[PDB]
Amino acid sequence: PLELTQSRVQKIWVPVDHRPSLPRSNSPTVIVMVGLPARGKTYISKKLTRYLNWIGVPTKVFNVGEYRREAVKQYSSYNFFRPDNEEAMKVRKQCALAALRDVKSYLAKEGGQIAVFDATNTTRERRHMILHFAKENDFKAFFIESVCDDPTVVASNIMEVKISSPDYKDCNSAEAMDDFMKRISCYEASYQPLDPDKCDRDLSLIKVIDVGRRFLVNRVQDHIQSRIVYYLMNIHVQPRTIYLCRHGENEHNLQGRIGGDSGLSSRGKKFASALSKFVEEQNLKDLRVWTSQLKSTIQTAEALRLPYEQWKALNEIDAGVCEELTYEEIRDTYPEEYALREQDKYYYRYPTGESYQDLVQRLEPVIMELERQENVLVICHQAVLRCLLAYFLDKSAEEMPYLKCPLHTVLKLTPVAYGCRVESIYLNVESVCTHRERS
Amino acid sequence: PLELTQSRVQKIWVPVDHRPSLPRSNSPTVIVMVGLPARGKTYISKKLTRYLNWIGVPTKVFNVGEYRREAVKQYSSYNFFRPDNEEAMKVRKQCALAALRDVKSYLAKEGGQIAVFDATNTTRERRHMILHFAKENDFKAFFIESVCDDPTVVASNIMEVKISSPDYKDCNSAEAMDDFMKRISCYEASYQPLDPDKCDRDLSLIKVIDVGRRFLVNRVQDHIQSRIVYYLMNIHVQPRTIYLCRHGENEHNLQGRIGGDSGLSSRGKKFASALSKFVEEQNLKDLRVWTSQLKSTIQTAEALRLPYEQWKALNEIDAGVCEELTYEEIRDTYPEEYALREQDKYYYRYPTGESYQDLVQRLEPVIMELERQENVLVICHQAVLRCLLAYFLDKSAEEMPYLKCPLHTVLKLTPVAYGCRVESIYLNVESVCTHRERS
Ligand SMILES: N#Cc1c(N)n(Cc2ccccc2)c2ccc(Oc3ccc(NC(=O)CN)cc3)cc12
Numbered sequence: 001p002l003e004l005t006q007s008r009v010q011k012i013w014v015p016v017d018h019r020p021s022l023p024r025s026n027s028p029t030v031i032v033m034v035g036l037p038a039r040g041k042t043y044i045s046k047k048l049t050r051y052l053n054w055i056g057v058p059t060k061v062f063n064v065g066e067y068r069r070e071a072v073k074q075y076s077s078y079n080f081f082r083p084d085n086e087e088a089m090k091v092r093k094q095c096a097l098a099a100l101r102d103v104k105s106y107l108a109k110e111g112g113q114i115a116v117f118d119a120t121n122t123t124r125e126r127r128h129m130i131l132h133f134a135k136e137n138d139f140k141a142f143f144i145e146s147v148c149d150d151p152t153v154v155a156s157n158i159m160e161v162k163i164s165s166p167d168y169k170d171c172n173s174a175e176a177m178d179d180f181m182k183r184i185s186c187y188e189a190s191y192q193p194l195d196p197d198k199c200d201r202d203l204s205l206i207k208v209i210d211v212g213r214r215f216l217v218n219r220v221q222d223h224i225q226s227r228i229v230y231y232l233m234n235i236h237v238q239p240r241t242i243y244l245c246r247h248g249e250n251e252h253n254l255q256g257r258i259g260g261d262s263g264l265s266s267r268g269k270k271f272a273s274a275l276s277k278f279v280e281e282q283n284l285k286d287l288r289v290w291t292s293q294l295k296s297t298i299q300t301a302e303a304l305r306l307p308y309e310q311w312k313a314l315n316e317i318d319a320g321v322c323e324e325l326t327y328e329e330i331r332d333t334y335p336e337e338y339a340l341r342e343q344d345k346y347y348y349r350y351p352t353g354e355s356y357q358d359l360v361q362r363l364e365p366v367i368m369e370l371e372r373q374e375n376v377l378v379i380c381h382q383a384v385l386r387c388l389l390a391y392f393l394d395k396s397a398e399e400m401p402y403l404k405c406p407l408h409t410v411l412k413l414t415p416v417a418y419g420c421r422v423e424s425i426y427l428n429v430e431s432v433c434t435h436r437e438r439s
Numbered sequence: 440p441l442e443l444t445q446s447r448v449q450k451i452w453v454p455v456d457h458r459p460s461l462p463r464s465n466s467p468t469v470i471v472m473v474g475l476p477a478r479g480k481t482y483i484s485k486k487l488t489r490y491l492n493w494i495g496v497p498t499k500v501f502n503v504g505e506y507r508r509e510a511v512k513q514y515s516s517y518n519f520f521r522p523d524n525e526e527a528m529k530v531r532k533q534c535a536l537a538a539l540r541d542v543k544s545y546l547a548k549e550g551g552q553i554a555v556f557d558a559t560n561t562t563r564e565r566r567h568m569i570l571h572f573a574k575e576n577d578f579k580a581f582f583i584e585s586v587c588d589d590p591t592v593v594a595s596n597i598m599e600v601k602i603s604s605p606d607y608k609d610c611n612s613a614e615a616m617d618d619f620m621k622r623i624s625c626y627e628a629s630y631q632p633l634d635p636d637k638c639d640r641d642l643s644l645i646k647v648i649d650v651g652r653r654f655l656v657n658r659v660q661d662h663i664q665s666r667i668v669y670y671l672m673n674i675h676v677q678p679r680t681i682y683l684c685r686h687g688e689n690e691h692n693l694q695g696r697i698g699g700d701s702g703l704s705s706r707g708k709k710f711a712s713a714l715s716k717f718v719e720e721q722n723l724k725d726l727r728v729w730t731s732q733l734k735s736t737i738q739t740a741e742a743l744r745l746p747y748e749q750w751k752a753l754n755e756i757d758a759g760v761c762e763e764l765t766y767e768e769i770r771d772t773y774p775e776e777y778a779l780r781e782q783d784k785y786y787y788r789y790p791t792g793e794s795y796q797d798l799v800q801r802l803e804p805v806i807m808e809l810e811r812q813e814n815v816l817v818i819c820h821q822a823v824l825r826c827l828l829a830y831f832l833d834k835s836a837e838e839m840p841y842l843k844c845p846l847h848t849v850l851k852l853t854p855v856a857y858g859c860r861v862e863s864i865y866l867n868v869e870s871v872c873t874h875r876e877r878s
Pocket residue numbers: 038039040041043044146147148153154157208211212213232233234235236237
C-alpha cells in the first residue's frame with residue numbers, strides 16, 4: 001500500500017496510477033475596476049494582471065473601451081459619452097455585456113482564474129448587474145475603486161497616457177485634453193462611489209484614495225484578495241530606476257560549469273570596476289544595492305564601495321545533483337534529465353534541486369520589496385535575472401527560461417506609461433556566453 | 440583586490456578584515472495601541488509581537504496596566520479609573536511615562552526594533568504626548584486602533600480574559616463583569632477615535648473595525664508597517680484546530696541518516712493508518728491537509744483518503760553536503776562543521792545547505808496561510824515542526840532547534856485566551872528517537 005511514483009519533469013510524488021481497463025478523467029474571481037476616467041484604473045488593471053500572471057494565477061484584463069473602439073470604428077468626441085446619447089449608451093452597454101460574455105468564457109472554459117473588468121462601473125446599477133453576472137456564474141466579485149480629486153494628478157494622467165490614446169490620433173495635445181475633460185464630466189453626475197458603510201457593506205472591496213495615500217478595505221474573503229491588497233499597499237507611483245545585472249564573470253563560467261560558489265575571474269573583476277564607474281556616472285541621490293549570498297555577486301558589489309544587502313532568495317537556481325557540472329557532463333551522466341529539461345525548461349526540476357517555477361516562488365518577496373523601493377541595483381545570476389525580467393517585461397512562463405541576460409551588461413528599467421522602458425548597457429568587458437537557445 | 444572570507448557558522452561571504460594595529464568598532468518603531476477596554480488591544484499586541492519576534496524583528500509589549508498593578512498593590516474597583524480621581528489619574532500618567540521610559544531604553548539601548556505601547560491611548564492629548572516622545576527619540580510611530588460597538592463581543596472578552604485578570608482575584612464572575620462595564624464607561628466620555636480624514640491625516644495608522652471585518656489604512660510608510668497590515672488582514676478570531684505532526688517513520692530514520700527522500704518504514708505505514716483513525720475520530724466538518732514535497736509526508740497523507748496540498752516550503756531543512764549521512768559520519772568527515780552546529784544550532788548553516796534561520800524565512804508564507812485557515816493538519820519534518828511550533832508556542836531562536844517533536848505524535852493546537860493550548864497525542868506506534876539534546 002501507499003505506492004507512489006516520482007513525476008519525471010517536476011519530480012512530484014504521485015500515487016501510482018494503474019488506470020482500470022476503461023481509464024476515466026477554487027471559484028474564479030471577477031475583479032471590478034471602479035472610478036471616473038483618468039483615475040489609473042487601466043494602470044492598476046495592467047500592473048496587477050502582470051503580477052498575478054507571474055506568480056502563476058492566470059489573469060486577463062477585459063477593457064470595455066477596447067470593445068467600443070472595435071464596435072465603433074472612428075472616435076470623434078466626448079459627445080459619444082453624453083448621458084443623452086441614446087444610441088451610444090446602447091452601444092456602450094452592448095460592449096460591456098460582450099466583455100462580460102468573454103469574462104464567462106475565460107473563467108469557465110479557458111482555465112482563467114482572475115478576470116479584471118476594466119471599466120468605469122461608476123453606477124450602482126452597472127455594479128448590481130456585474131454582481132448578478134458573478135452570482136449566476138459562481139464567480140467571486142472583488143471591487144477596486146480609485147478615488148482622486150487632485151486636478152494636477154488628473155491633468156498629468158491625460159498628458160501621459162490619454163492624449164496618446166488611439167481615440168486622439170487626429171487631435172493635437174490641447175484638443176485631446178479639452179475633449180477628455182468634457183468626457184470625464186459626462187460621468188460625474190451619475191457617479192455613485194463605493195459605500196462600504198451602508199450600501200456596499202457586504203461587498204469585498206478596496207478603495208485606493210489619493211493615489212495610494214489611504215485605503216478602505218472591506219470584507220477580504222480569501223488569499224488572492226489579501227495578496228492584491230498587500231501588493232497595492234507596496235507599489236507606488238514615485239519616479240525611480242531599477243538596474244539589474246549578473247555578477248562579473250566567475251571561474252565556473254570559464255569552465256562552462258553550472259551552480260557552485262566560485263569567485264570572479266580577472267574579467268569579472270574588470271566588470272566590477274566598470275560597474276562602479278557606471279553607477280557613479282548615473283548620479284543617483286540614493287541607491288540600494290542587493291546581492292545574492294553567493295561570492296561572485298558580493299565581490300561585484302564590493303567594487304562599488306556602497307552599502308549592500310545579501311538576499312538568499314537571489315541565489316542562483318539550485319541544480320541539485322547537477323551542481324558544479326558542465327552541460328556536456330550533464331548530457332553524458334544524466335541524458336534523460338538533460339532531454340526532459342530541454343523539453344520543459346520552466347517546470348523541469350533538477351533532482352534534489354529547483355525549477356524556474358520554484359525560483360518565482362522564492363523571488364516573490366524580492367519583487368514585493370523592489371516595488372516598495374526607489375533606485376535599486378540588483379546583482380544576481382542568469383536564471384534569477386530571467387525570472388525578475390519576466391516580471392518587469394510581462395514575459396510568460398514559456399519564454400522566461402530563454403530570456404537573454406548576458407554577462408557584463410546592465411539592464412536599466414524605467415517605469416513609464418503602463419510598462420517598463422528597458423535600456424541595455426554593455427560595460428565593454430569581455431566574458432564567455434552562457435546563453436543556450438531552445439532545441 | 441575584493442578579498443572575501445566565508446564566516447564559519449552562517450557561511451556568509453564577508454570582506455577579509457585585516458584590522459589595523461588599533462582595531463576600531465533603520466529607525467525603531469513605537470506601535471501605539473488605541474481603543475476602549477475589552478477591544479482586543481492586548482490580544483493584538485501579544486499576537487503581533489509573537490509573529491514579529493519569530494520572523495526576527497526584536498519586539499516587546501509595554502502594557503501600562505502591568506506598571507499600574509506594580510505601583511498600586513491591590514485593585515479594589517472601577518473607582519480607580521474615575522475621571523474625577525485626581526490621585527489615581529496622576530498615578531496612571533506616571534505609569535504610562537515609566538512604560539515610555541522603558542520603551543526608550545528598549546529601542547535605543549537594548550537592540551529592540553519594535554515597542555508595542557499597549558494602553559487605551561483614547562485621547563488626542565495622550566497620543567500627542569506619545570508622538571512628541573517618538574519625534575524627540577527619532578522613533579517612528581504606527582497606530583493600531585480597535586473599534587467595536589457590539590455588546591456581545593465586549594461581554595465575551597470580559598468573560599474570556601477580563602474576569603480571570605489578577606485585578607478580579609477576590610471577585611466572582613458577576614461582580615467582575617459589572618465592575619469592568621463601569622470601568623469601560625470611565626473612558627467613553629474622553630474617547631477621541633483616530634480621525635485619518637482631518638486630525639490624524641499625517642499619522643501612520645490602521646483602524647481595525649468590527650473585529651477585522653473592515654480596515655482603514657492610512658500612510659503606510661515602510662516594510663514592517665505593510666507586513667503588520669497584511670498580517671492583521673490574514674488572522675481571524677474564528678474557532679479552529681491546528682494539528683501538526685511529522686511523516687510516519689522512514690527508512691533513513693531507521694539508519695540514523697539525515698535528509699534524503701526515503702519512504703515510510705513498516706512502522707511509519709502503521710502510524711499513517713493510526714493517523715487516519717485519529718483524524719476520523721476528531722469529526723471535523725472540513726479539514727485542510729498539508730504536506731511537504733518529500734515522499735514520507737505524502738505517503739502519510741495518502742493513508743488519510745483526504746485531499747492534500749504539497750508545499751515545497753514544508754520540505755525538511757537542507758543539510759547541503761551532509762545530506763543522507765548519519766550524525767556519526769558527519770562528526771568523522773566534518774568534525775569542525777559538527778562542533779560549529781552544536782555551539783550555534785539556530786544560526787549554523789550547513790555547507791550548500793540551510794540554517795533554522797533560513798527555515799523561518801521559508802516558512803513565513805506557511806504561517807500566513809495557517810493564520811487564514813481554520814482546521815489544518817500539517818504533516819512535515821522535525822526541523823520544520825520545531826520552527827512552526829516555536830511560532831505558535833512563542834519560543835525563542837535559541838530554544839527552537841531543541842524543541843521535542845517526536846515521531847508518531849500529533850500536536851493539537853487550540854487558540855484560546857492570548858495563547859495556544861497544546862495537547863500531545865501519541866498514536867501508539869513504535870519508532871526510533873531522532874531528538875538530540877544540547878552539549
Ligand atoms: N487617481 C489616480 C491615478 C493616476 N492618475 N495614476 C496614473 C499615474 C501614472 C504614473 C505616475 C503617476 C500616476 C494612478 C496610478 C495608480 C493608482 O493606484 C494606486 C496608486 C498607489 C498605490 N499604493 C501606494 O502608493 C502605497 N505605497 C496603489 C494603487 C492611481 C492612479
